[PDB]
Symmetry: C2
């Protein structure tokens, strides 16, 4: 494959899991920092556009990490409450919200993440929460 | 594949043909300019390590370009006359010099290039000469 070292190939993308508990905001900033303008490579929190991509991302994550917990993804509704969008600017199609989610619990949940159960069913969580994270390269 | 837009994939690498006449020196700089330090991607003039890579590069070039002329590659003997090496630090195994080449013509030819004939058989040319050029990404 043609992925940078320490990134994994799948389809037209590269992915990299970071086994560090941090905030969504910091995970987002970390992923974006790998970007490279000279090749128009965007690095960003992972966006998910199919069941296949969901399964790949989840299976990659849980192949390395077996702790109970969550995995930040690039979905958020910070700018317009209830309207979830991807940080990489790609259009939302596929969704996999867990039962009862999203719920904007305590009016402070704007940041998307996989649960470790139900094949990575999604939850919205707060700016104070911690989770692991996953970056994705997009060749723009 | 996982190559950047406007680059082509083959094996563990990406390649990109630039259909513009320029000097070897400028071609070298142009190719290195596509490097991405955050992803440990080194871009350089193409190095050629087998008959397969030779044919891939030649056929890629000649898929686009109909003109008689040459294609700069990363081979040079600028720093040690008569010992051609790759700018990307990979070792010279495979060679495909044209008959009568290299000849260090007028004591001034230190830069490698494919001819548009004989499957891209190589010639050494001067710092004043012009050719098209091909870059290559190496994921270090
Ligand atoms: C393009 C090409 O192969 N050019 C060469 C050149 O480098 C020099 O070797 C010369 C010797 O008469 O013959 C050819 O012109
Ligand atoms: C990790 C996770 O899913 N946490 C949620 C949380 O965001 C909140 O929605 C809550 C509402 O009771 O329930 C949980 O299941
Ligand atoms: Ca909000
Ligand atoms: Ca919200
Ligand atoms: Ca929630
Ligand atoms: Ca010389
Ligand atoms: Ca020479
Ligand atoms: Ca020559």
């Amino acid at each position: 494959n043609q992925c940078p070292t320490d990134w994994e190939a799948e389809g037209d993308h590269c992915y990299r899991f970071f086994n560090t508990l941090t905030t969504w905001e910091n995970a987002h900033h970390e992923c974006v920092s790998y970007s490279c303008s000279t090749l128009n490579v965007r690095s960003d929190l992972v966006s998910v556009h199919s069941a296949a991509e969901q399964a790949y991302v989840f299976n990659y994550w849980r192949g390395i990490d077996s702790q109970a917990g969550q995995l930040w993804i690039g979905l958020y509704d910070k700018y317009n409450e209830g309207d979830f969008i991807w940080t990489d600017g790609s259009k939302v199609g596929y969704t996999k919200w867990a039962g009862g989610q999203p719920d904007n619990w305590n009016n402070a949940e704007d940041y998307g993440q996989f649960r470790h159960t139900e094949g990575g069913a999604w939850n919205d969580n707060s700016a104070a929460a911690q989770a692991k994270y996953m970056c994705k390269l997009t060749f723009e």
